[PDB]
């Protein structure tokens, strides 16, 4: 048996392994200490158990659920399609998109852990406490998730 | 506002999208007889029912789309579940594996199951050994309402 936190990290890694080489855009915000309820209220309610397969199905392009942010709360997908604050992007390379602006903006006003798969490049990135970590390998991505979510 | 009313609205809207697009769908609704043996074969979601989620689940060539969705107590309990296929012999070529699963489940349970054919977009329902096929959208909604409400 393995924890819900462990299962959730495994699901994130597997979903990103699928989405990145396919350049499927994804935006997943994980609530930590600071409540994300104000943003959850803007999404489509799922209140679903997390699996790699559901995360992939959510982000498949041109589906009712793929635009906007998935928000995770207490090891459940509370909503999809939530609206996150967008950071100002003066001077930012053209390669980054609205998903990166939403992840950075959320990290500037909360302690949430947010990750992005770029629709433009398939790049993997994470925001946390105002820091932007981009062009991660899958293994570096997993290491960041574990360091933050399992700070053992 | 009832859970049953909300669930029926979501079924109807999901089928309004899938039927003209010939998107195959297989949704089994637990009634009195428990479907736990089949739920155990699927991918756990335990999710609120919405038309948006039902549509997203069944999009072709996606991880969740193969197999049956099973509804339990007005949640999506699982997707991708295996149902028993009927051995009823006389079933036309028009009907495929989703239909045989719906028929097979109705033979051994009081579940209400509906199917959208991936070959024709046709809508059908199985319930208590009966097979109602080629329903119009309005006939489909009427059956759901008669059986579930």
UniProtKB/TrEMBL annotation, chain A:
<protein>
    <recommendedName>
        <fullName>Diadenylate cyclase</fullName>
        <ecNumber>2.7.7.85</ecNumber>
    </recommendedName>
</protein>
<dbReference type="GO" id="GO:0106408">
    <property type="term" value="F:diadenylate cyclase activity"/>
</dbReference>
<keyword id="KW-1003">Cell membrane</keyword>
<keyword id="KW-1133">Transmembrane helix</keyword>
<keyword id="KW-0812">Transmembrane</keyword>
<keyword id="KW-0548">Nucleotidyltransferase</keyword>
<keyword id="KW-0067">ATP-binding</keyword>
<keyword id="KW-0808">Transferase</keyword>
<feature type="binding site">
    <location>
        <position position="98"/>
    </location>
    <ligand>
        <name>AMP</name>
    </ligand>
</feature>
<dbReference type="GO" id="GO:0005524">
    <property type="term" value="F:ATP binding"/>
</dbReference>
<dbReference type="GO" id="GO:0004016">
    <property type="term" value="F:adenylate cyclase activity"/>
</dbReference>
<keyword id="KW-0472">Membrane</keyword>
<comment type="function">
    <text>Catalyzes the condensation of 2 ATP molecules into cyclic di-AMP (c-di-AMP), a second messenger used to regulate differing processes in different bacteria.</text>
</comment>
<keyword id="KW-0547">Nucleotide-binding</keyword>
<dbReference type="GO" id="GO:0006171">
    <property type="term" value="P:cAMP biosynthetic process"/>
</dbReference>
<feature type="binding site">
    <location>
        <position position="84"/>
    </location>
    <ligand>
        <name>AMP</name>
    </ligand>
</feature>
<comment type="subunit">
    <text>Probably a homodimer.</text>
</comment>
<comment type="similarity">
    <text>Belongs to the adenylate cyclase family. DacA/CdaA subfamily.</text>
</comment>
<feature type="binding site">
    <location>
        <position position="68"/>
    </location>
    <ligand>
        <name>AMP</name>
    </ligand>
</feature>
<feature type="binding site">
    <location>
        <position position="67"/>
    </location>
    <ligand>
        <name>AMP</name>
    </ligand>
</feature>
<feature type="domain" description="DAC">
    <location>
        <begin position="1"/>
        <end position="138"/>
    </location>
</feature>
Automatic annotation (TrEMBL), chain B:
<comment type="subunit">
    <text>Probably a homodimer.</text>
</comment>
<keyword id="KW-1003">Cell membrane</keyword>
<keyword id="KW-0067">ATP-binding</keyword>
<feature type="binding site">
    <location>
        <position position="66"/>
    </location>
    <ligand>
        <name>AMP</name>
    </ligand>
</feature>
<comment type="similarity">
    <text>Belongs to the adenylate cyclase family. DacA/CdaA subfamily.</text>
</comment>
<feature type="domain" description="DAC">
    <location>
        <begin position="1"/>
        <end position="137"/>
    </location>
</feature>
<feature type="binding site">
    <location>
        <position position="97"/>
    </location>
    <ligand>
        <name>AMP</name>
    </ligand>
</feature>
<keyword id="KW-0547">Nucleotide-binding</keyword>
<protein>
    <recommendedName>
        <fullName>Diadenylate cyclase</fullName>
        <ecNumber>2.7.7.85</ecNumber>
    </recommendedName>
</protein>
<dbReference type="GO" id="GO:0005524">
    <property type="term" value="F:ATP binding"/>
</dbReference>
<keyword id="KW-0808">Transferase</keyword>
<comment type="function">
    <text>Catalyzes the condensation of 2 ATP molecules into cyclic di-AMP (c-di-AMP), a second messenger used to regulate differing processes in different bacteria.</text>
</comment>
<keyword id="KW-0812">Transmembrane</keyword>
<keyword id="KW-0472">Membrane</keyword>
<dbReference type="GO" id="GO:0004016">
    <property type="term" value="F:adenylate cyclase activity"/>
</dbReference>
<feature type="binding site">
    <location>
        <position position="83"/>
    </location>
    <ligand>
        <name>AMP</name>
    </ligand>
</feature>
<dbReference type="GO" id="GO:0106408">
    <property type="term" value="F:diadenylate cyclase activity"/>
</dbReference>
<dbReference type="GO" id="GO:0006171">
    <property type="term" value="P:cAMP biosynthetic process"/>
</dbReference>
<keyword id="KW-0548">Nucleotidyltransferase</keyword>
<keyword id="KW-1133">Transmembrane helix</keyword>
<feature type="binding site">
    <location>
        <position position="67"/>
    </location>
    <ligand>
        <name>AMP</name>
    </ligand>
</feature>
